[PDB]
Amino acid sequence: MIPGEYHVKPGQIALNTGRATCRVVVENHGDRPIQVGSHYHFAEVNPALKFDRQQAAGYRLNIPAGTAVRFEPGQKREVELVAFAGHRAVFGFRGEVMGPL
């Protein structure tokens, strides 16, 4: 007996199903680490991260909500992106879009 214990049924949860995704190779050319969140508009991340910003337009990291991907200086890696939904309107970040798309 453990007070308030969970009895989670075994298995897995499929995340962001039925949505467009794409893989991109990213490389940190800066001298300081960069960490990106699950819902940040990938195309507007820190300028030191080198990748195809054009392909990442309207996309975010395809990772569980609230988690992140870290890039140490000089680190190169391939990430999977998932397209934004809702109105597909991007406001904020580095102020590059500030509207639909």
């Binding site: 453990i2 009895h7 049924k9 897995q12 609230g66 597909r88 309107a89």
Partner: protein, 566 residues
């Protein structure tokens, strides 16, 4: 991508099909539904989801909620579901999926710059409790009840006076006015009961016109057929509720005479089992009638090994009885019956008794209404097994039946369900957040009208709010003008129209009671059973359809020694 169910539960709380143990009881609840879109859950914190352009949108205050409880596991009479809860203008805005419509799908609860966040992942959220049997013996009772998870208190009294020690009555216009004014200082919703024991209608109408939302008929003031008829007549014309504590002495008649005096009119019977007061030994037979809304007070809940022993002296002090006066001790004894006490737990499990209350400091414990209700559920599961209504391998239905006893049913009985009593859109945002390990015992956060009113708080000078000692302390929702804005003082329709709030210069929000005459047993959520119940005059045995109703006394109970320092 993909994530395992266990890791998922650790991050966002359980989902469909997962079960959770309620505190240290044997009751398990299973998540019935989850209103989220997997991968789009909102989470707040460093580098999380609720950030500008991401989980937070660009809308003005008018188009977003003031507060969101993220990933909450709701337990209410209508379901046990996982969802986000939005609160706007101190009221429940919506139960759904929160976030930013700009980039997320299925958002029904928009989060913007004007939105505060309460992280409920891994927590159970319920409506605030409603205790309708309060004896206003001291103001300290409000904090005790609030800390337990009770946000509305209905009762009567003027302080530690003999009349209030014994009865839930705030006698007359002067005392009623005084208590309505004092109520602004307390962090709970309040409604008052007047003294209904009189055979002159106008003496009752004055009290209702002064502000009471109900009338208490008590035997200590004379629970005679004449007084009962008078109170019910006035109640029928002013749309207020009558609470009854019948003639234990059978002085004016037996239970059948009282029932006849009531004449099919709506009435709330307090402590229907009898120990707290009522026709000896069969007042319990009242739960068979359609016009009777029956409740229990808490000391007899549930039947345990020490129950009987502690009742005699408790009885005496509460009613100003003299242990040296033989007649005084004989009538105290006739109220304490092992037979009816044992049956009461089963009648609750069957839905024959529809409410639980305290009877604060007059044969009842103000901070134990919720706790004892769950102990009864546990003891009943242990003894009787699954209810006929259960579906699946969980106790979901029994949980919905019991939670209704201190939330929606008391609200319906007293005509305040339009304002409080459940987690439904438009109702006042009185919510209680619990950690599963402490469910029903010690809340994590108590919210009143959209503001946190009390919560456990650690060292004030610490670097974080968690360091010891951690104990319950009043928050901003319990302070001055913010409090006034987050609590309600309930008035009768007549008082509201008479301008009582303006005359007394009441600072809190005002709510009016209505629908007290039209509620009947059939309206009690999940607790509408009207059994063919009988009590043996000699043996006191309780039978339903001829079968004997009984249970065994507990030697040890959950939600007890594992949580309390004393």
């Amino acid at each position: 991508s993909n994530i395992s169910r266990q890791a998922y539960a650790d991050m966002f709380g359980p989902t469909v099909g997962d079960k959770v143990r309620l505190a240290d009881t044997e009751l398990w609840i299973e998540v019935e539904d989850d209103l989220t879109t997997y991968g789009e859950e909102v989470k707040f914190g460093g580098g999380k989801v609720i950030r500008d352009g991401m989980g937070q949108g660009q809308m003005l205050a008018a188009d977003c909620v003031d507060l969101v409880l993220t990933n909450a596991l709701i337990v209410d009479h209508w379901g046990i579901v996982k969802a986000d809860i939005g609160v706007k203008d101190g009221r429940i805005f919506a139960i759904g999926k929160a976030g930013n419509p700009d980039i997320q799908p299925n958002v029904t609860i928009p989060i913007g710059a004007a939105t505060e966040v309460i992280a409920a992942e891994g927590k159970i959220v319920t409506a605030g409790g409603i205790d309708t049997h309060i004896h206003w013996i001291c103001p300290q009772q409000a904090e005790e009840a609030l800390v337990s998870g009770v946000t509305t208190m209905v009762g009567g009294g003027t302080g530690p006076a003999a009349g209030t020690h014994a009865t839930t009555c705030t006698p007359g216009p002067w005392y009623i006015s005084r208590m309505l004014q004092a109520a602004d200082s307390l962090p709970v919703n309040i409604g008052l009961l007047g003294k209904g024991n009189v055979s002159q209608p106008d003496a009752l109408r004055e009290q209702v016109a002064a502000g009471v939302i109900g009338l208490k008929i008590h035997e200590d003031w004379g629970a005679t057929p004449a007084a009962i008829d008078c109170a019910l007549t006035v109640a029928d014309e002013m749309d207020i509720q009558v609470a009854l504590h019948s003639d234990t002495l059978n002085e004016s008649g037996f239970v059948e005479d009282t029932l006849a005096a009531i004449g099919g009119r709506t009435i709330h019977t307090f402590h229907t089992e009898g120990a707290g007061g009522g026709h000896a030994p069969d007042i319990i037979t009242a739960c068979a009638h359609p016009n009777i809304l029956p409740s229990s007070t808490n000391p007899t809940l549930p039947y345990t090994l020490n129950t009987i022993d502690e009742h005699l002296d408790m009885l005496m002090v509460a009613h100003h009885l003299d242990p040296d006066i033989a007649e005084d001790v004989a009538f105290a004894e006739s109220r304490i019956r092992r037979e009816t006490i044992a049956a009461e737990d089963v009648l609750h499990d069957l839905g024959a008794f529809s409410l639980t209350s305290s009877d604060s400091q007059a044969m009842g414990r103000v901070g134990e209404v919720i706790l004892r209700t769950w102990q009864v559920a546990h003891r009943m599961k242990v003894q009787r097994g699954a209810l006929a209504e259960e579906t699946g391998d969980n106790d979901n239905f029994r949980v919905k039946r019991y939670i209704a006893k201190y939330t929606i049913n008391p609200a319906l009985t007293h005509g305040i369900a339009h304002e409080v009593g459940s987690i439904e859109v438009g109702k006042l945002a009185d919510l209680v957040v619990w950690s599963p390990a402490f469910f029903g015992v010690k809340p994590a956060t108590v919210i009143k009208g959209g503001m946190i009113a009390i919560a456990p708080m650690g060292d004030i000078n610490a670097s974080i709010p968690t360091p010891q000692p951690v104990h319950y302390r009043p928050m901003f929702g319990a302070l001055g003008s913010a409090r006034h804005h987050c609590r309600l003082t309930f008035l009768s329709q007549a008082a509201a129209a008479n301008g009582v709030a303006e005359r007394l210069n009441l600072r809190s929000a005002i709510a009016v009671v209505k629908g007290c005459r039209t509620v009947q047993k059939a309206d009690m959520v999940h607790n509408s059973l009207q059994p063919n119940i009988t009590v043996d005059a000699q043996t006191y045995e309780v039978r339903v359809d001829g079968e004997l109703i009984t249970s065994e006394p507990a030697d040890v109970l959950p939600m007890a020694q594992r949580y309390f320092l004393f």
